[PDB]
């Protein structure tokens, strides 16, 4: 595995999205991971539909919450997920309106990385591509992150209240990090991104709930 990796440089990542006031981070996270695999498999990069997941993954709670694992399973069982263009994002609860004609990607299942194993997470990211992960993003410092490697001794790994996407990893002046793509718009963090402390005792619980879909 490379000392550092950044899948944005390998065309696996779409631009930052804005989930709005709907707690659908798990949908954007799942979609990001899926978009990466689709690119790896077909060579094409397309915006997948998070609203499709929000409205159709009954295993989850729509804007009220959910897990990326349930999303990947839905795509597999549903035999597909629509493109963002075929099922645009509104960030509001609506009955499922999935349409197979707009299908843009399928899923063969998913794998989970050993809970709290950042070493496993590193290897997974380097080999697979973008990986869905959960973190404690409740701290004010996270809300107003601007640059640098984010680290706060107050983060609680047991409080997984947000789902994001790890598109790579690296180091900055002795501080190892995870390159994280958020879904709170480009007006947050660094153009929507944030570098988070890596190998710092699983800061914010970044390795507690990480998984990726297979295609
Ligand atoms: C998103 N958006 C979102 N997700 N959760 C959540 C619940 C259970 C499990 C997960 C995950 F990612 F699978 F592990 C995620 C959640 O509780 N909320 C409420 C978030 C409140 N925010 C906390 C950080 C500060 C901003 C507000 C979600 O919105």
Swiss-Prot record:
Record EC number: 3.4.22.38
Reactions it catalyzes: Broad proteolytic activity. With small-molecule substrates and inhibitors, the major determinant of specificity is P2, which is preferably Leu, Met > Phe, and not Arg
BP-aspect Gene Ontology terms: bone resorption; collagen catabolic process; extracellular matrix disassembly; mitophagy; negative regulation of cartilage development; proteolysis; proteolysis involved in protein catabolic process; thyroid hormone generation
Catalytic residues of the enzyme: 25, 162, 182
Record's protein name: Cathepsin K
Function according to Swiss-Prot or TrEMBL: Thiol protease involved in osteoclastic bone resorption and may participate partially in the disorder of bone remodeling. Displays potent endoprotease activity against fibrinogen at acid pH. May play an important role in extracellular matrix degradation. Involved in the release of thyroid hormone thyroxine (T4) by limited proteolysis of TG/thyroglobulin in the thyroid follicle lumen.
Tissue specificity note: Predominantly expressed in osteoclasts (bones). Expressed in thyroid epithelial cells.
Gene: CTSK
Family: Belongs to the peptidase C1 family.
Region of the whole protein represented: 115 to 329 of 329
Topological type in the membrane: Peripheral membrane protein
Disease tied to this protein: Pycnodysostosis: A rare autosomal recessive bone disorder characterized by deformity of the skull, maxilla and phalanges, osteosclerosis, and fragility of bone.
Membrane-spanning segments: none
GO terms for MF: collagen binding; cysteine-type endopeptidase activity; cysteine-type peptidase activity; fibronectin binding; proteoglycan binding; serine-type endopeptidase activity
Glycoprotein as UniProt keyword: yes
Organism: Homo sapiens
